[PDB]
Amino acid sequence: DPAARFQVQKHSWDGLRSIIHGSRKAPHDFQFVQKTDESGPHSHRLYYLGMPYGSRENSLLYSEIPKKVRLLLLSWKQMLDHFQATPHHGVYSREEELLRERKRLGVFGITSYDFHSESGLFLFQASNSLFHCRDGGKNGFMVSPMKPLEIKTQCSGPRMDPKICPADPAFFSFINNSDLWVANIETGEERRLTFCHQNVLDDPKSAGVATFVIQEEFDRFTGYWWCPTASWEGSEGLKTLRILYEEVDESEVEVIHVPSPALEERKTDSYRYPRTGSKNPKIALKLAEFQTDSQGKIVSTQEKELVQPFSSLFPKVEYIARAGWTRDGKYAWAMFLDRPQQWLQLVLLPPALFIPSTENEEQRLASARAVPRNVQPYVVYEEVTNVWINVHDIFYPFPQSEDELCFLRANECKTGFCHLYKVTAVLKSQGYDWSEPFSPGEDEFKCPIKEEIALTSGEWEVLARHGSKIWVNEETKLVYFQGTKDTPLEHHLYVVSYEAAGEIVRLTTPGFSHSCSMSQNFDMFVSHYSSVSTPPCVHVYKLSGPDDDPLHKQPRFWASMMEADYVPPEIFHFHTRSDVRLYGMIYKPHALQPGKKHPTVLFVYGGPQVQLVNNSFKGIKYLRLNTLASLGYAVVVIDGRGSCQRGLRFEGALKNQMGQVEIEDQVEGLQFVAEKYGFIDLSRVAIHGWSYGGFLSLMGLIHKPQVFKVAIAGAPVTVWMAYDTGYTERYMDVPENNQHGYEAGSVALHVEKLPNEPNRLLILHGFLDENVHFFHTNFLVSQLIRAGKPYQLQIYPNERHSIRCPESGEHYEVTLLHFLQEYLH
Amino acid sequence: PAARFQVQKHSWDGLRSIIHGSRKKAPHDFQFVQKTDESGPHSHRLYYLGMPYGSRENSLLYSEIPKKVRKEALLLLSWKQMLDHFQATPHHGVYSREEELLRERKRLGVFGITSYDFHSESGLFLFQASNSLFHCRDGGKNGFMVSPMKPLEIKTQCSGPRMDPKICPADPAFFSFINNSDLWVANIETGEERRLTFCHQGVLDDPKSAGVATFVIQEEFDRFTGYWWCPTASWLKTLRILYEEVDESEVEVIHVPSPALEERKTDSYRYPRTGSKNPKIALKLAEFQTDSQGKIVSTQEKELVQPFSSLFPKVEYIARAGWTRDGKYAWAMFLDRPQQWLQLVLLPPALFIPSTENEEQRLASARAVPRNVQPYVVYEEVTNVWINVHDIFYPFPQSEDELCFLRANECKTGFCHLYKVTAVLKSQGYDWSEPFSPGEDEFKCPIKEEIALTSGEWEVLARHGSKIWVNEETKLVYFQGTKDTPLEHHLYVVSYEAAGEIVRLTTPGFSHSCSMSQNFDMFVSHYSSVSTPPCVHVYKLSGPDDDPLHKQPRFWASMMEADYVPPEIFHFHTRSDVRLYGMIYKPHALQPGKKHPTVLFVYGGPQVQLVNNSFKGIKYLRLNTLASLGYAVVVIDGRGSCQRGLRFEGALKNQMGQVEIEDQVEGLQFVAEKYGFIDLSRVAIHGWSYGGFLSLMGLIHKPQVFKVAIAGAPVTVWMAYDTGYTERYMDVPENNQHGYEAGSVALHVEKLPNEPNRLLILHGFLDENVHFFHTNFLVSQLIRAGKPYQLQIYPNERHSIRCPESGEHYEVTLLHFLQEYL
Numbered sequence A: 001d002p003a004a005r006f007q008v009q010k011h012s013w014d015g016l017r018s019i020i021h022g023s024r025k026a027p028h029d030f031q032f033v034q035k036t037d038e039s040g041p042h043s044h045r046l047y048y049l050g051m052p053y054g055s056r057e058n059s060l061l062y063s064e065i066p067k068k069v070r071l072l073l074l075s076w077k078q079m080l081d082h083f084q085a086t087p088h089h090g091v092y093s094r095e096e097e098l099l100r101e102r103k104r105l106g107v108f109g110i111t112s113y114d115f116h117s118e119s120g121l122f123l124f125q126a127s128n129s130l131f132h133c134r135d136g137g138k139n140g141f142m143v144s145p146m147k148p149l150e151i152k153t154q155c156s157g158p159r160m161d162p163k164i165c166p167a168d169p170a171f172f173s174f175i176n177n178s179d180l181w182v183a184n185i186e187t188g189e190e191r192r193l194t195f196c197h198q199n200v201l202d203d204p205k206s207a208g209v210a211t212f213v214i215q216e217e218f219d220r221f222t223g224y225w226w227c228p229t230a231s232w233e234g235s236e237g238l239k240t241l242r243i244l245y246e247e248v249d250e251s252e253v254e255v256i257h258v259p260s261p262a263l264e265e266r267k268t269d270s271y272r273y274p275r276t277g278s279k280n281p282k283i284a285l286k287l288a289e290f291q292t293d294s295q296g297k298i299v300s301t302q303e304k305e306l307v308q309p310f311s312s313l314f315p316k317v318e319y320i321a322r323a324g325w326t327r328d329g330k331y332a333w334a335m336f337l338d339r340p341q342q343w344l345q346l347v348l349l350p351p352a353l354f355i356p357s358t359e360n361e362e363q364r365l366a367s368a369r370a371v372p373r374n375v376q377p378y379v380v381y382e383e384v385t386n387v388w389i390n391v392h393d394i395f396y397p398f399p400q401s402e403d404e405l406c407f408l409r410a411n412e413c414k415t416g417f418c419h420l421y422k423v424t425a426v427l428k429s430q431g432y433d434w435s436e437p438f439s440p441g442e443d444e445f446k447c448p449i450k451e452e453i454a455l456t457s458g459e460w461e462v463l464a465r466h467g468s469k470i471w472v473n474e475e476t477k478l479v480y481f482q483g484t485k486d487t488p489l490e491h492h493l494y495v496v497s498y499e500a501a502g503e504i505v506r507l508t509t510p511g512f513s514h515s516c517s518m519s520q521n522f523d524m525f526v527s528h529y530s531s532v533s534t535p536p537c538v539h540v541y542k543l544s545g546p547d548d549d550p551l552h553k554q555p556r557f558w559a560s561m562m563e564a565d566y567v568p569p570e571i572f573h574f575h576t577r578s579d580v581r582l583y584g585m586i587y588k589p590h591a592l593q594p595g596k597k598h599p600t601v602l603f604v605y606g607g608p609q610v611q612l613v614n615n616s617f618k619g620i621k622y623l624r625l626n627t628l629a630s631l632g633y634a635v636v637v638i639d640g641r642g643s644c645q646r647g648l649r650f651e652g653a654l655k656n657q658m659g660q661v662e663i664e665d666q667v668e669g670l671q672f673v674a675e676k677y678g679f680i681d682l683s684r685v686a687i688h689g690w691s692y693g694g695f696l697s698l699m700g701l702i703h704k705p706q707v708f709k710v711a712i713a714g715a716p717v718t719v720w721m722a723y724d725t726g727y728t729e730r731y732m733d734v735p736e737n738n739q740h741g742y743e744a745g746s747v748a749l750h751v752e753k754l755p756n757e758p759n760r761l762l763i764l765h766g767f768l769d770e771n772v773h774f775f776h777t778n779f780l781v782s783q784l785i786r787a788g789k790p791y792q793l794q795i796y797p798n799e800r801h802s803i804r805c806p807e808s809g810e811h812y813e814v815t816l817l818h819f820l821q822e823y824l825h
Numbered sequence B: 001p002a003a004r005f006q007v008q009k010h011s012w013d014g015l016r017s018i019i020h021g022s023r024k025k026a027p028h029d030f031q032f033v034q035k036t037d038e039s040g041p042h043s044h045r046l047y048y049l050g051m052p053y054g055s056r057e058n059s060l061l062y063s064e065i066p067k068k069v070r071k072e073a074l075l076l077l078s079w080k081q082m083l084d085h086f087q088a089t090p091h092h093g094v095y096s097r098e099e100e101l102l103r104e105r106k107r108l109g110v111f112g113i114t115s116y117d118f119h120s121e122s123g124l125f126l127f128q129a130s131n132s133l134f135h136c137r138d139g140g141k142n143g144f145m146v147s148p149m150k151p152l153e154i155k156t157q158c159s160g161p162r163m164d165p166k167i168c169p170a171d172p173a174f175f176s177f178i179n180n181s182d183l184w185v186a187n188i189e190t191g192e193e194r195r196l197t198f199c200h201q202g203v204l205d206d207p208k209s210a211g212v213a214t215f216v217i218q219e220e221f222d223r224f225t226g227y228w229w230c231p232t233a234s235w236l237k238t239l240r241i242l243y244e245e246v247d248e249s250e251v252e253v254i255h256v257p258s259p260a261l262e263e264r265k266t267d268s269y270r271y272p273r274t275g276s277k278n279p280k281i282a283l284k285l286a287e288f289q290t291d292s293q294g295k296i297v298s299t300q301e302k303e304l305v306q307p308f309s310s311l312f313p314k315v316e317y318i319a320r321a322g323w324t325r326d327g328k329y330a331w332a333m334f335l336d337r338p339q340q341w342l343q344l345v346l347l348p349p350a351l352f353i354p355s356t357e358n359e360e361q362r363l364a365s366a367r368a369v370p371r372n373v374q375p376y377v378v379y380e381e382v383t384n385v386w387i388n389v390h391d392i393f394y395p396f397p398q399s400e401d402e403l404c405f406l407r408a409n410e411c412k413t414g415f416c417h418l419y420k421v422t423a424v425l426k427s428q429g430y431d432w433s434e435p436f437s438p439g440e441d442e443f444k445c446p447i448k449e450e451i452a453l454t455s456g457e458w459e460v461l462a463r464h465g466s467k468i469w470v471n472e473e474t475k476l477v478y479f480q481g482t483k484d485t486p487l488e489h490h491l492y493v494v495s496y497e498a499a500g501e502i503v504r505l506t507t508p509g510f511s512h513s514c515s516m517s518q519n520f521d522m523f524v525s526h527y528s529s530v531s532t533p534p535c536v537h538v539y540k541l542s543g544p545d546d547d548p549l550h551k552q553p554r555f556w557a558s559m560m561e562a563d564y565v566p567p568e569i570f571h572f573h574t575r576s577d578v579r580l581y582g583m584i585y586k587p588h589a590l591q592p593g594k595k596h597p598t599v600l601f602v603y604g605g606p607q608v609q610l611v612n613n614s615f616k617g618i619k620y621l622r623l624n625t626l627a628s629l630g631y632a633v634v635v636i637d638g639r640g641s642c643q644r645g646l647r648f649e650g651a652l653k654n655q656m657g658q659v660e661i662e663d664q665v666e667g668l669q670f671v672a673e674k675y676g677f678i679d680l681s682r683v684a685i686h687g688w689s690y691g692g693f694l695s696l697m698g699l700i701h702k703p704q705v706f707k708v709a710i711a712g713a714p715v716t717v718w719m720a721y722d723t724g725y726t727e728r729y730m731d732v733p734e735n736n737q738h739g740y741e742a743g744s745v746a747l748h749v750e751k752l753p754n755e756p757n758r759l760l761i762l763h764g765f766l767d768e769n770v771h772f773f774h775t776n777f778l779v780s781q782l783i784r785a786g787k788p789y790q791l792q793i794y795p796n797e798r799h800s801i802r803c804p805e806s807g808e809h810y811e812v813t814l815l816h817f818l819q820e821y822l
């Protein structure tokens, strides 16, 4: 009991600063391009985004893949010649900074780019502007880097979301001031295609734009999609180009004010923020045509809209999750969702279904009568559930060979795990009088399913979210994908035949988790892979073997791109009293002496769409947990029920009772860790997490005060009523439908249950947080004062939902160390 | 050793009960009205605003002053209600935005009726209540009631609040108000309403306003009104209103959070930061004609015959305005942007012509204005330090071609004193139809005489509601002042005819807040001392009518009477021989030889004196509570503080932060030697606003003196504070780079402590005076230097913690922070 309890060494504030300062002192976004020159030594050029160790910023790079190897390390050749993509002092525009928050982009420089393979044209944002360069194809392969040519513009403000036109690389598109524009890269000609935008709250219409809740909660960063092929309709031979697009009216969506980064100005910015229960934007898919002559001059432009309203045709639809087109350009498609997020629909939209917009009532019925009777929406798929629809990206339509459609689809709600299915929907025209107005039935456009074959199955998932995707080879009839079949703790690359659902073959080595990228030629892949114990590598594997059995191509290591007082944690697992396997992670105290009992930090997140505990390298993002361990803290992480990678039913334990299930699992994990490992002092446990983790830190202190001595709640969710529609309604329902659950899970309403003793609660929040508004902390403090309750608080004035600036970051870590040092006893 | 007194360490529940155990407005806004009835038993009815001990809200009250009182018994007057079971405070204490902000600008803590207007002959009372307007009739033609009457609400077609109600002096059938930043008028008898200005439309696109005091004018110049009734009618009959018209277009906007935290919205505010543009301003006139039936016939919008910017090129702020009692001239009190040059300017009504968009009509009216008519600059106060705005300006009626007036003047000698002045109004002759450029001293009247009525090393009180009363029969001016001592306000009287004997009418050993009968036969004094709680007594002025200067004030009757240990006032001299006054709370149940930990409670900015001889136990209960636990609490009025004249206050000029802490350290070291109980090893500095600023300056510049600092709502960056206050003491930023930087505590964060537990920051989130930005930007810079801090926010609080539950939490936190860390 006396000598048994390990006392942490108490440092001064400057001492802790030096400790934090001392502790702190990869290739992605790939494009495989084959070289058509047998006499040269290189088979491919691999293009990618990457940040070298010497460089400040992310940039466009390339490596040369050789034809024969005798351990190769590939050189990182620069593409742009001494180019600063990041603007002066890292100070982005408002639109571009907010895109970086919605995409969680910590890195400076070029973060997306667009590529067109045949022409070899690269298109990207840089310097709060647009830029381009040419390599490969007709332009040829460069040895030395080339300066990227800036694209001139008559538009004022930022040009967001550049995309090259697939049908014609002379053309490209962008968003300027919430409208769709198009332009000619060769001639410099620009043309505006939508006219939704003009002042501020007085200007609620926008076009080609994903709104806040769509970006943040549905992972869609665009609301326009190029048609992939061109028509040649007209009198005298003009070429037509199309863009499907989301139109938005935000009139009835509540406004909130968030402070500007320019603190000296003392202003806010206005923002359409749909809180749970309140109105989301009024939405529509519209179509935009434009014609071109043989000289590349944009002749005419047209605004088209659906022949009947979007709200009449699709009466139950609340959000457009995803959209695009078939590869031949025959149909546009969309992925729709109801407001509960328990009913999804994959809908085809023929171009003939769209007619020109006019304000005149006479003209619209003429164009409506001119639409063929056979033309209509075709609902090819319908996913339904008692839990919720997670949006899965995978939807690969095969080109038709009319009257049916074959496609691959990721589906979780059928069995409870996300799996690939091949589906044939039967397209049969009911015949519709589009001029006379129209009320659809409950299954109005629902295609019959001819067959639905399961390609994958089991107690494991195909990855289809947060950038995971399939690669489909139509020669060999194989679908390449990623998944958890080996284990929840490791991502792995698999291959399976979509023709014949037989043997799934694993192509990545076990004991590591893999983030993979395929050649469109299917001859080689990259895997950026890692483990808990080993830092990440990036290797190039060539798929080799006889062409008579392409399923069993043995992956042979070709070459490498990246290689290589930190002590890794140990994964463990355990069963709850209800027989549910939970995984956990422990960092042991460094230089441990058995028999000692050490104070413990329960690091938590615990919300949906995150798995903390898996077999990949943690020392980059979670260095602070190792730093804690270097001082003699036990650090424990538990993936409780709710967390992702374990299918729908595991996730679904949260449904309408957020806060209620999670802490019990965390307590069980903490008590398991106590019995297994001999070094936890349960008298000195601290709970700590950001966002949902801060919410859970507060729930731990409220419901389990004898378990947790202190709480360091970062950016916490204190009032579920103040969070958005998309996230909150999905897990917790609308507020009027779940009064008991909203109240029970709102930490601000249970402040009487928070401690009478001071030094047991530290709150942290970013002042500029536009995700979880500082209100949450403000309102928690308001209620803490009303109940007569002590608290400590730290603001980060130049910081949103994450602490990006290093000096702020170091200060955060020093404070945490001091709070634990002085008060965790 | 055993000598160091250690405070008893309580749990948080313990400190909460301590604070709750400790905590478990007087008659003001007086009107004397004589009873015109020899047979009846009462000489006067005294009307006033007041709040009984049982009652929640402030309300309109009266007492009956009897004709004879028994001199054996001490007679206590009854507080009779005017209104019959009336709630003046709106539902849940939730005022409108305009009305809540007026209560912040006035520091009005109390709920209910905070102002009212009275008309004496008719007996009409007019006042805001229930976010609406109300009236009742008593005295005069209406007669004197015994029991209370229900106040009649005034119906209106206006939407939103009706601000700033005033009865027309010339005709009590009429009254005025502000609705949506424009002047309106209405007839109380007939219910007819008429709008007179059209500056506001239907708030960034809509910058013009009429009849409105802007933010900096309310907050920094003590003017809460932008329109002034003419006191007489010309003859149908015309009635007049002088008004300030205002354009806020070029004034920067800032966003402050709304009280509705759930909304997560802000409110826009024209906030002129130091160096940036103040409003473009103007005096205009609004006339309206009435028939014998009380119908408003016609209305006219009038403007000065030449522009305001051409006539008065150097004038930046309109400090005050009004009219002469006969209605002959309007007048205004002007100021330059440095605030070192003031002008009292008379403005004849004939100088104003109808506004028209037609140039031909404007030149018709412009040619028609007489050549002899003009502005008359009757006074000019100028200084190297700054012009404090003094209210006192009494124009005598003209017994033409000259003007006698009384004027309070501080810049002449360095102390504020009464002078009788005769200006000669001689008409220079002006071609008003052609435009022209005034130079310096263009309209400067010659001074015939300027006689000093008062003089000495002491001040006449003329700010923050202080005023004179002038009796014209007896040729006496009654006033208030510090002639006896800086620590006590006292009532004096002196002849404006013959500048001779100043006679004191209030008893020494107390500080007095007085109000005179306009009949000069009796006064009220609301008075107190450091040792004794406040009383409100009625004194009758008695004696021979041939010698009115020596009327002996005899106590007539009383209105208000009354583990607290009062502090002890002291004084001492600096190394430079400047007398500073100070206050100490000794530790309760002191054992001499013990050395106790100490709280230096500080304010230290301009326009405040903390240390005087009046009761502190109401407003500074927390300082006694500190003392009850064994803290020494020391308060020092350093150089810069008010009540000491201009040169003492002027020690601040262009070096805020630099002089004040030295005087605080000197006072603290003096207190150490004199009183045997200060442990200088355990000294904390604590203050709000300027005090928080100084608490931070104490920690920066004297870290070996002060162990901890509890900075409340601090001024951390002088560049972020307003024009009116900052430019006056610290100049423009372009003119004082060295001083702005030296006095900005946010820029010297490297000098703040490396050790944690030495700095507690506190701030109201809804503070629209000292924006939360100040704390925010201090924290931002604390992070950049790698410096520890603790922080507390008040989410439902502006510049003051008004809500009691917030207040208790604030006090508990302070006790815990001191207990653990001092």
Ligand SMILES: *C(#N)[C]1[C][C](F)[C]N1C(=O)[C]([N])[C]1[C][C][C][C][C]1
Pocket: A216, A217, A607, A608, A609, A610, A690, A691, A692, A717, A727, A771, A772
């Ligand atoms: C945090 N984290 C906040 C508040 C609430 F807990 C959810 N949340 C989010 O950031 C979500 N928008 C993210 C959804 C995508 C994957 C991570 C969480």
Ligand SMILES: *C(#N)[C]1[C][C](F)[C]N1C(=O)[C]([N])[C]1[C][C][C][C][C]1
Pocket: B219, B220, B605, B606, B607, B608, B688, B689, B690, B691, B715, B725, B769, B770
């Ligand atoms: C505080 N107090 C704030 C900041 C600074 F100290 C000045 N200040 C004020 O509120 C002033 N505008 C007041 C003027 C009238 C008398 C008291 C100070």
